Design a binder for these strands. Structure first.
Ligand code: DZ4
Ligand code: MN
Ligand code: MN
Length: 425
DNA sequence: ATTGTGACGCT
DNA sequence: AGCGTCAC
């Protein structure tokens, strides 16, 4: 009753760019704007692999991981932008820099946790407190929430329904209680409208957002009304939302763990999890996972918004599928040097921008016929940003996998170099 | 012949 | 440290 914490202490937002790589290319090339278009990597094998898809193209069924020739079968007028190639591999620099633009804007409002190249979590608790004290008791107008949906409303034209649900929400707000969680979420949604307006004005990129009490609910909310809209998921809306929500839709339950939850417990939806005790869930899935599941099916999650805007690792990877697998010493050396050269460029830029230096170099390889995505992962010291030294060290670390008696056997299907363990510089 | 990343957990 | 899981 009174002593049961409800997970309503924080206001957390998740902001995620709409078809991000496509928007980057459309800003650069106006001919692609408001068109079915996609961003692809490489071009020889089946027109290239698709990695981003505009919503106009999604209406025809084009998806990520689709080959471009098959997408053209679905959408003959599909326009394509190619990822930059450098040193024989895809180079994502343009998208990382656009990401930095977005992150730097978001950092002006509150402390963000970079969750991916195109999304970040925001802890807005202090911001909502300050804004509530500054309001001094005046109500919140629907004009301050022009693109916000309230999940589970209305109850009892899409824009008409959105406005109806918003009016229902706002008419029920207790604006004199500065401690009301629903009011806090609402003021958070106002701040998030402002953040998304600033992002669009200063970059041209549109984004969606979720506003709730934790990271999981914020991300789930963000996905509900994409694109170019934001969604507030309140504590009280959790029972209904979760009553038909497949378990796999919740962050971290999309893989084998969610499948085991479904199979062992004989359930399909998130809300059904409430029928089990914490001890039962711990017995089936471990203490940490069990506590997490017991709280999460009730809308409660405590994972903090970490103050980390920069990545922790800088990596360079290339696959060599099929008959292109590396089978000679010279091939492995040359590709290790290409990877190390891109890595050195990015590492020097990172040192100059962020006042830090990586100290450990991770080398990973996949070998042909091996079932696992990574066949070997070994680390060595990273003492200077030199591509020749880094590639030589990677070769020294991996050379005992060659079972040949000039040749390389069995052939390598993936190379991977990663700089980690940063220290202030 | 989804590719190229990046974070975090387990032992 | 090296391997595995998960998303993005
Ligand atoms: N599997 C993958 N492989 C390579 N690049 C990928 C990728 N998945 C995503 N990217 C790249 C391309 C993506 O543009 C970008 C952000 O990933 P999302 O947010 O998951 N997808 P998007 O922003 O496109 O659309 P929306 O959020 O509106 O549904 O990262
Ligand atoms: Mn996105
Ligand atoms: Mn994303």
């Amino acid at each position: 009753g009174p002593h049961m914490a409800t997970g309503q202490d924080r206001v957390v937002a998740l902001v995620d760019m709409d078809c991000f790589f496509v928007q980057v290319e459309q800003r650069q090339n106006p001919h692609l704007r408001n068109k079915p278009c996609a961003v692809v990597q490489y071009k020889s094998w089946k027109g290239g692999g698709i990695i981003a898809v505009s919503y106009e193209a999604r209406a025809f069924g084009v998806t990520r991981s689709m080959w471009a020739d098959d997408a053209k079968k679905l959408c003959p007028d599909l326009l394509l932008a190619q990822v930059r190639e450098s040193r024989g591999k895809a180079n994502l620099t343009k998208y990382r820099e656009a990401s930095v633009e977005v992150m730097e804007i978001m950092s002006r409002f509150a402390v963000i946790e970079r969750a991916s190249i195109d999304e970040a979590y925001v802890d807005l608790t202090s911001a909502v407190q300050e804004r509530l004290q500054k309001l001094q008791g005046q109500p919140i107008s629907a004009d301050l929430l022009p693109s916000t949906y309230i999940e589970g409303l209305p109850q009892g034209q899409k824009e008409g329904m959105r406005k109806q649900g918003l009016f229902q929400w706002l008419d029920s707000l207790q604006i004199d209680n500065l401690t009301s969680p629903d009011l806090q979420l609402t003021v958070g949604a106002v701040i998030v409208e402002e953040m998304r307006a600033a992002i669009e004005r200063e970059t041209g990129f549109q984004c969606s957002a979720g506003i709730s009490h934790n990271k999981v609910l914020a991300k789930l909310a963000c996905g509900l009304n994409k694109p170019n809209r934001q969604t507030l998921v309140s504590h009280g809306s959790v029972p209904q939302l979760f009553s038909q929500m497949p378990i796999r839709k919740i962050r971290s339950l999309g893989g084998k763990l969610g499948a085991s939850v479904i199979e062992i417990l004989g359930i399909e939806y998130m809300g059904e999890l409430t029928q089990f005790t914490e001890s039962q869930l711990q017995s089936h899935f471990g203490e940490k996972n069990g506590s997490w599941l017991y709280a999460m099916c009730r809308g409660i999650e405590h994972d903090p918004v970490k103050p980390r805007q920069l990545p922790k690792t800088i990596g360079c990877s290339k696959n060599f599928p099929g008959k292109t697998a590396l089978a000679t010493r010279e091939q492995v050396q040359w590709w290790l040097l290409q990877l190390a050269q891109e890595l050195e460029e990015r590492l020097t830029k990172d040192r100059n921008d962020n006042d830090r230096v990586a100290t450990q170099l991770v080398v990973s390889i996949r070998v042909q016929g091996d079932k696992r995505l990574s066949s070997l992962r070994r680390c060595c010291a990273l003492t200077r940003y030199d591509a020749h030294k880094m590639s030589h060290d990677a070769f020294t670390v991996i050379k005992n996998c060659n079972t040949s008696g000039t040749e390389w056997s069995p052939p390598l299907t993936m190379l991977f170099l990663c700089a980690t363990k940063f220290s202030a510089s």
